[PDB]
Amino acid sequence: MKLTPKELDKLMLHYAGELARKRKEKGIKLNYVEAVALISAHIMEEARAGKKTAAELMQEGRTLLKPDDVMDGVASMIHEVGIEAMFPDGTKLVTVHTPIEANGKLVPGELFLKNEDITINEGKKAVSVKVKNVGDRPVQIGSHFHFFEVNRCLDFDREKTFGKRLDIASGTAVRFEPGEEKSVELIDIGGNRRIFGFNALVDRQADNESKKIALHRAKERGFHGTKSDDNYVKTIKE
């Protein structure tokens, strides 16, 4: 047979699903493990039969278990069942999203939230800058990127954005479609304001003296919207 470790794991999973199906036949309401295993084993068998596509199986995994077939609390615990199955065209990942609908009141890990909003970046004044993507490719910018050093294809008044980042939720992003034009809010970067990396445009302390060096470097490297005055005077370290 030359079974691999994967084949042994999948055989164990198939028989866990078989036990789940037997218990469902006996009239027992399935718990979390049984529901997960039943969905996974059904998907594997369907993929072995070779008569359905992976997308069909993603849709079919959601009709196996009605809400009355599982215990209270089960539906809210199974966000997604992923299972890798071998189709005639090879191994594909099938994920079923929210296979079971909630019918009871039991929610394990239920979150009870205050209805008050969170104020982020408190004490930081936000300026508004209009930005246009003159390139032919999409550009996405995160919350803590130094906005002065974004893709050179974005065009905006770079001088007003030095030492600033997007005033959005941490870990979120703003997208710029090709040709898209929109305005964004920028707050000052906090901490020691020591900007290293990102395009190597600053790589030092952020201040008015280093803003001139950054503007000159940006203009030399073709960053759009950069207007650094001609007759630039170099310093001893650039």
Partner 1 sequence: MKKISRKEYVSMYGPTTGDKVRLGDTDLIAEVEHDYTIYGEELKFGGGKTLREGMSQSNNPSKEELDLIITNALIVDYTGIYKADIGIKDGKIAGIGKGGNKDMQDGVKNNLSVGPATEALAGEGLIVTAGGIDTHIHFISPQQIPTAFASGVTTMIGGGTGPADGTNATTITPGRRNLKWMLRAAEEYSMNLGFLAKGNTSNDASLADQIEAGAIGFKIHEDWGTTPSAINHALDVADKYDVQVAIHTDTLNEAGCVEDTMAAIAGRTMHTFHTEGAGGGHAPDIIKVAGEHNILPASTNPTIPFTVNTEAEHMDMLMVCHHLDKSIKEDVQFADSRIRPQTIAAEDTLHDMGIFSITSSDSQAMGRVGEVITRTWQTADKNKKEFGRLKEEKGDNDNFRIKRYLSKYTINPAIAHGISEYVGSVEVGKVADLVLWSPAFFGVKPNMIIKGGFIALSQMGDANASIPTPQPVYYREMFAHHGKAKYDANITFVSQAAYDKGIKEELGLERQVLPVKNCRNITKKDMQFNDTTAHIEVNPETYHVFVDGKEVTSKPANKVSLAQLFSIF
Site for partner 1 in 142-181 (CB under 8 A): 142-146, 149-153, 167-173, 175, 177-178
Q: Give min distance, CB of 33 to its own copies, in A.
A: 5
The entry of its own copies, partner 1, none near residue 15 (CB within 5 to 8 angstroms by kind) is: its own copies
Q: Give min distance, CB of 10 to partner 1, in A.
A: 4
Residues binding its own copies (CB under 8 A): 1-3, 7-8, 11-12, 14-16, 19, 23, 26, 28, 32-33, 36-37, 45, 48-49
Q: Which residue has the tokens 């027992």?
A: 28
Pick out residues in 215-234 that bind partner 1 (CB under 8 A): none
Look at residues 163, 165, 164 and name the one whose alpha carbon lies nearest to residue 210.
163
The entry of its own copies, partner 1, none near residue 222 (CB within 5 to 8 angstroms by kind) is: none
Q: Give min distance, CB of 20 to partner 1, in A.
A: 8
Is 51 one of the binding residues for partner 1 (CB under 8 A)?
A: no
CB 165 within 8 A of CB 187: yes
In this complex, which beta carbon is closest to partner 1, that of residue 65 or of residue 189?
189
Contacts of 133 (CB under 8 A, 6+ apart): 139, 153, 154, 155, 176, 177, 178, 179, 180, 181
Residue 28 has, within 13 A of its CA and on its CB side, a CA count of 12
Q: Give min distance, CB of 208 to its own copies, in A.
A: 56
Phi and psi (nearest 5°) for 44?
-60, -45
| Count of positions on this chain that bind partner 1 (CB under 8 A) | 124
Secondary structure (DSSP) of 138-193: -EEEETTS-GGGS-TTEES-GGGGTTEEE-S-TT-EEEE-TT-EEEEEEEE--TT-
Residue 26, class by beta-carbon neighbours within 10 Å (0-12 exposed, 13-18 middle, 19+ buried)?
Answer: exposed
Q: Give min distance, CB of 82 to its own copies, in A.
A: 12
Give the one residue of 104, 132, 199, 228 binding partner 1; rule: CB under 8 A.
Answer: 199
Helix (H) or strand (E) holding 130: strand 127-133
In this complex, which beta carbon is closest to its own copies, that of residue 90 or of residue 123?
90
Collapsing DSSP to helix, strand or coil, 15 comes out as helix
User: Which listed range, 60-68, 108-116, 224-232, lies at the site for partner 1 (CB under 8 A)?
Assistant: 108-116
Q: Give min distance, CB of 178 to its own copies, in A.
A: 45
